[PDB]
Amino acid sequence: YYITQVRKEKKGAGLEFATPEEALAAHERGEVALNAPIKVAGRETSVGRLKYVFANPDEALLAVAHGIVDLQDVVTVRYMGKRLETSPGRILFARIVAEAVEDEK
Amino acid sequence: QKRKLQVGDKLANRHGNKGVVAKILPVEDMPHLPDGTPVDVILNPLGV
Amino acid sequence: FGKRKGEGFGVDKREVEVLRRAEKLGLVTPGKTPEEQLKELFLQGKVVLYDGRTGEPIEGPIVVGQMFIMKLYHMVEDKMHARSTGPYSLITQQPLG
Amino acid sequence: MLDSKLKAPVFTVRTQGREYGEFVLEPLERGFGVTLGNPLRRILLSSIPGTAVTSVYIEDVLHEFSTIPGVKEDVVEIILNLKELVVRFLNPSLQTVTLLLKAEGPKEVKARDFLPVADVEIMNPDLHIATLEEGGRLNMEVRVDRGVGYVPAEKHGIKDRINAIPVDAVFSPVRRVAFQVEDTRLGQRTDLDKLTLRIWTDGSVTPLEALNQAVEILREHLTYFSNPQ
Amino acid sequence: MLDSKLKAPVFTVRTQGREYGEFVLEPLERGFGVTLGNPLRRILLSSIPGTAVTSVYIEDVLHEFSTIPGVKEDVVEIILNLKELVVRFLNPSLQTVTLLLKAEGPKEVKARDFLPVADVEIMNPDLHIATLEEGGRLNMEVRVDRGVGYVPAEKHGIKDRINAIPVDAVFSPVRRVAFQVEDTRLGQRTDLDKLTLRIWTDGSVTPLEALNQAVEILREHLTYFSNPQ
Numbered sequence: 001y002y003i004t005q006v007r008k009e010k011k012g013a014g015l016e017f018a019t020p021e022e023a024l025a026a027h028e029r030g031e032v033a034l035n036a037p038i039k040v041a042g043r044e045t046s047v048g049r050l051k052y053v054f055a056n057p058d059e060a061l062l063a064v065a066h067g068i069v070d071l072q073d074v075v076t077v078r079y080m081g082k083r084l085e086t087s088p089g090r091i092l093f094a095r096i097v098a099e100a101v102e103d104e105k
Numbered sequence: 106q107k108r109k110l111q112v113g114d115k116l117a118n119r120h121g122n123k124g125v126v127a128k129i130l131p132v133e134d135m136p137h138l139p140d141g142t143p144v145d146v147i148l149n150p151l152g153v
Numbered sequence: 154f155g156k157r158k159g160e161g162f163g164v165d166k167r168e169v170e171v172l173r174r175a176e177k178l179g180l181v182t183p184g185k186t187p188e189e190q191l192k193e194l195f196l197q198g199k200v201v202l203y204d205g206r207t208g209e210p211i212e213g214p215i216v217v218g219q220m221f222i223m224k225l226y227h228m229v230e231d232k233m234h235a236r237s238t239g240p241y242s243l244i245t246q247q248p249l250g
Numbered sequence: 251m252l253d254s255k256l257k258a259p260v261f262t263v264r265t266q267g268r269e270y271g272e273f274v275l276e277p278l279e280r281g282f283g284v285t286l287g288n289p290l291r292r293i294l295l296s297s298i299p300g301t302a303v304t305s306v307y308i309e310d311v312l313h314e315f316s317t318i319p320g321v322k323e324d325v326v327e328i329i330l331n332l333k334e335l336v337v338r339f340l341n342p343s344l345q346t347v348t349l350l351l352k353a354e355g356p357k358e359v360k361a362r363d364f365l366p367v368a369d370v371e372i373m374n375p376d377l378h379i380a381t382l383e384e385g386g387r388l389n390m391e392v393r394v395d396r397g398v399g400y401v402p403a404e405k406h407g408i409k410d411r412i413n414a415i416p417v418d419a420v421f422s423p424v425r426r427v428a429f430q431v432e433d434t435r436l437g438q439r440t441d442l443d444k445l446t447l448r449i450w451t452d453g454s455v456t457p458l459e460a461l462n463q464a465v466e467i468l469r470e471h472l473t474y475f476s477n478p479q
Numbered sequence: 480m481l482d483s484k485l486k487a488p489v490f491t492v493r494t495q496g497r498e499y500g501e502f503v504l505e506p507l508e509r510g511f512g513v514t515l516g517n518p519l520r521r522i523l524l525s526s527i528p529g530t531a532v533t534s535v536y537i538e539d540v541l542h543e544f545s546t547i548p549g550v551k552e553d554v555v556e557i558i559l560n561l562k563e564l565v566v567r568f569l570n571p572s573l574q575t576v577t578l579l580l581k582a583e584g585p586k587e588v589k590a591r592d593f594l595p596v597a598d599v600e601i602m603n604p605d606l607h608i609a610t611l612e613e614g615g616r617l618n619m620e621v622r623v624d625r626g627v628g629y630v631p632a633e634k635h636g637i638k639d640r641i642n643a644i645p646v647d648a649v650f651s652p653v654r655r656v657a658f659q660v661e662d663t664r665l666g667q668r669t670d671l672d673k674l675t676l677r678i679w680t681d682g683s684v685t686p687l688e689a690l691n692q693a694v695e696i697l698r699e700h701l702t703y704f705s706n707p708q
Binding site for chain 4: 131133134
Binding site for chain 4: 706
């Protein structure tokens with residue numbers, strides 16, 4: 001369980017990145033600051049998704065090991081043909097099973 | 106005869122957590138605190 | 154931790170690391186110093202623990218402490234009974250020990 | 251030798267290609283497979299220094315979230331595909347190499363399309379960078395460096411050209427590490443550690459090579475315990 | 480040397496007696512203090528050799544569960560206090576040393592009361608063996624050996640004298656290990672690992688000695704990766 005859950009921390013200033021570009025920038029810097037969390041209730045993507053994008057599957061966990069992203073954090077990842085907004089842990093669970101039985105799909 | 110603690114044995118606090126020893130771990134690798142003092146027994150939370 | 158201060162050292166990469174995950178959890182008041190945070194985290198009864206097998210920390214503070222524990226008496230049954238062949242009852246012909 | 255020393259780690263290897271390589275070693279005393287595999291792993295991922303795309307500059311593009319006309323892919327998917335690019339330079343003299351590429355019109359842009367550099371080689375030629383339609387103008391300069399571990403694009407913030415955009419650093423020929431410590435029975439005592447570690451590699455180096463480099467970095471570090479003070 | 484190699488692990492040591500010994504070493508790259516301290520720790524506790532009471536013979540006592548007149552303590556409490564005894568011999572020639580002691584009447588028997596042996600030293604003199612009242616006759620022979628780890632008295636079963644009683648083997652000279660990885664700042668980059676490991680020892684060996692033996696066991700193991708198969 002613990003490995004696949006996602007977190008939500010503090011809602012203070014605006015949560016609107018769905019639309020403005022000044023919204024990506026400002027809530028990215030404000031997040032860098034102390035006001036916006038990496039897991040904020042902001043419909044489309046909390047800055048936590050804005051900050052990190054992971055190309056291959058593995059790319060995601062490496063960042064986890066280095067201390068960049070916790071497993072329960074909300075990030076974006078590129079799997080087979082989709083840009084999927086799923087947490088590290090969830091992505092890892094996926095592999096466990098994908099490995100247990102090699103018919104990955 | 107002297108009976109040293111072993112895996113078949115069962116220990117339990119005064120509250121009721123009863124249980125048996127399932128593994129005697131080498132002080133080598135069990136959970137250790139920042140200062141080198143290691144833990145003696147590791148109790149499962151789920152039983153609480 | 155007082156002795157830790159005087160003995161000569163401060164906080165681990167590990168110690169800070171578990172803190173990060175601890176604040177995202179909600180155990181420590183975000184924005185305070187690790188020294189201050191650990192006090193908080195300690196008061197809660199839990200402290201940071203390293204794996205031992207890996208040396209890495211155990212993500213999230215774990216409680217620890219002095220718990221009294223007694224050992225329980227082993228009954229004669231405890232003596233694991235394994236029987237191959239042996240006696241048999243006189244009237245009923247089923248295995249008896 | 252015959253008794254305790256002949257009873258020595260039987261180093262057995264199984265490797266297919268330059269990507270996968272299993273390595274078994276037993277017998278070992280109590281809890282050593284762990285004592286060895288773990289450090290090696292930590293080394294195998296951070297220390298086998300490597301190469302990764304550290305920065306990019308599309309000529310008409312200013313920010314990372316832009317889209318180029320005639321170009322199906324968006325800046326973000328391309329800078330992502332570049333993270334997938336694996337290069338290999340031959341000597342220290344090459345710390346930071348800027349690879350250049352410019353392609354126009356109805357052509358597919360692959361990594362082989364980058365102008366060759368003397369001491370640098372691209373192991374990822376057929377990798378897919380982009381699909382250009384018509385009047386498709388893509389001229390870029392992608393930086394490449396030698397480092398260790400993972401470095402968020404935020405951490406370094408490279409500045410070759412002011413309109414350039416940094417990319418996250420993926421520095422290791424080693425894709426993933428994995429070690430198992432299963433019990434093995436040797437005559438007298440059962441308690442025995444069998445360490446087998448599986449290494450995966452992008453191809454740049456080989457699992458075996460990797461492992462060797464690894465153990466060395468460890469050894470070299472064990473020597474640093476020489477002069478007291 | 481001047482730049483990257485002069486910038487080398489400053490091995491600094493602080494040791495008082497043969498029990499405690501702190502060992503600092505910095506700077507180190509990213510996450511290496513942990514990469515090193517942990518294995519050494521695992522070694523420092525399992526792998527290092529020492530000394531422990533392996534057998535005892537009280538002259539009038541036949542079994543371990545007896546009690547001697549004029550002697551407050553019972554055989555079991557005494558054989559227990561002996562486990563607390565820490566000796567130190569100086570060379571291989573001394574594999575098994577039998578320490579002898581005989582005391583009578585109104586005297587307290589401490590470890591210093593053992594008759595001296597040429598190449599053996601008792602670091603635990605004031606330890607309390609027993610309290611003798613009057614007409615208190617205690618004459619014993621306690622064996623001592625050099626071994627590794629823990630060995631239950633059941634496992635070895637020593638036989639010097641038929642009425643003797645074996646004792647459990649407490650051989651790791653290392654009492655406890657502890658290492659800290661605090662950040663250190665060196666000019667340019669702040670991320671730096673400072674590894675300092677504090678070692679404690681019963682006295683048999685010394686922290687420094689211990690540590691050295693440790694790193695070697697590791698080194699010796701890193702070489703076992705030599706011949707593929």
